[PDB]
């Protein structure tokens, strides 16, 4: 009348963890007819941004800086046209790489204070990274926990028919907490 019976349980491993890496790129841009003057204002912009980051808790060894990217437009602020401008435009990037992930919130709310110096900072939310770089290291024990939780629900009794493993998910806790990640895995076990 019946040929087999099997029971299926899904085991859940879930953990909140704190991101260990914050990558925060701060771009700032200037224009000038004289290229030497563009570099001097960028360099002065860079010094003021660094001072604000150090006040915020960032250390010097967490700040990285590439050569500014300079575009020659060959324009002039005298030529009567609808598209006249300064000849050169330069954009620079101060790239923060730190394990002090809780610094990011305060940096992003106060960076407007640099408007004083005439600094134009652009920070793209898409390129702000809060990572838990230990993610792959923690997977084996969470897989065991899920598989184990599945077995113990089955207790509450033959061999194992099928074993499957979902992929890990990793989500921010709240919107206000990007430096805290929720990590989940589900292990599915079917017994006879």
Here the CATH number for the domain that contains residue 86 is 3.30.70.2970
Q: How far is the C-alpha of 82 from the C-alpha of 106, rounded, in Å?
A: 41
Resolution (A): 2.5
Decide: 9 and 188 in contact? Cβ < 8 Å: yes
Determine the structural domain holding residue 115 and report its residue range.
21-131
Q: Which residues of 130-164 are buried (b: 16+ CB within 10 A; e: fewer)?
A: bebeeeeebeeebbebbbebbeeebeeeeeeeeee
Q: How far is the C-alpha of 61 from the C-alpha of 149, rounded, in Å?
A: 44
Q: How far is the C-alpha of 104 from the C-alpha of 95, rounded, in Å?
A: 12
Nearest-10 Cα torsion for 164, 168, 171, 173: 70
Q: How far is the C-alpha of 157 from the C-alpha of 36, rounded, in Å?
A: 80
Question: Per DSSP, what are the bridge partners of residue 84?
Answer: none
Q: How far is the C-alpha of 39 from the C-alpha of 25, rounded, in Å?
A: 20
Helix, strand or coil, per DSSP, at residue 95? strand
CA distance between the termini of the chain: 17
Decide: 52 and 110 in contact? Cβ < 8 Å: yes
Alpha helices in 56-134 (DSSP H): 103-110
Q: How far is the C-alpha of 8 from the C-alpha of 63, rounded, in Å?
A: 52
Q: How far is the C-alpha of 165 from the C-alpha of 130, rounded, in Å?
A: 26
């Amino acid at each position: 009348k019946t040929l087999e019976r099997s029971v299926s349980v899904k085991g859940l491993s879930q953990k909140e963890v704190e991101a260990d890496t914050l990558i925060l790129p701060i771009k700032f841009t200037r224009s000038n007819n004289n290229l030497t003057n563009l570099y001097e204002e960028l360099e002065q912009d860079k010094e003021n941004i660094i001072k604000f980051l150090k006040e915020q808790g960032v250390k010097e060894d967490e700040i990285n800086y590439n050569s500014p990217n300079i575009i020659d437009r060959l324009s002039d602020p005298y030529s009567n046209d609808t598209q006249a401008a300064y000849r050169y435009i330069g954009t620079a990037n101060l790239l923060i790489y730190t394990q002090n992930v809780k610094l990011g919130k305060s940096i992003l709310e106060n960076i407007s204070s640099l408007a004083k110096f005439g600094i134009v900072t652009k920070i793209d939310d898409y390129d702000i990274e809060y990572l838990y770089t230990k993610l792959n290291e923690i997977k084996p024990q969470m897989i065991e926990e899920a598989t184990l939780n599945a077995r113990n629900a089955a207790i509450k009794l033959g061999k194992i028919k099928k074993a499957s493993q979902g992929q890990f998910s990793i989500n921010n806790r709240d919107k206000n907490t990007p430096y805290i990640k929720t990590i989940r895995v589900v292990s599915t076990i079917e017994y006879y």
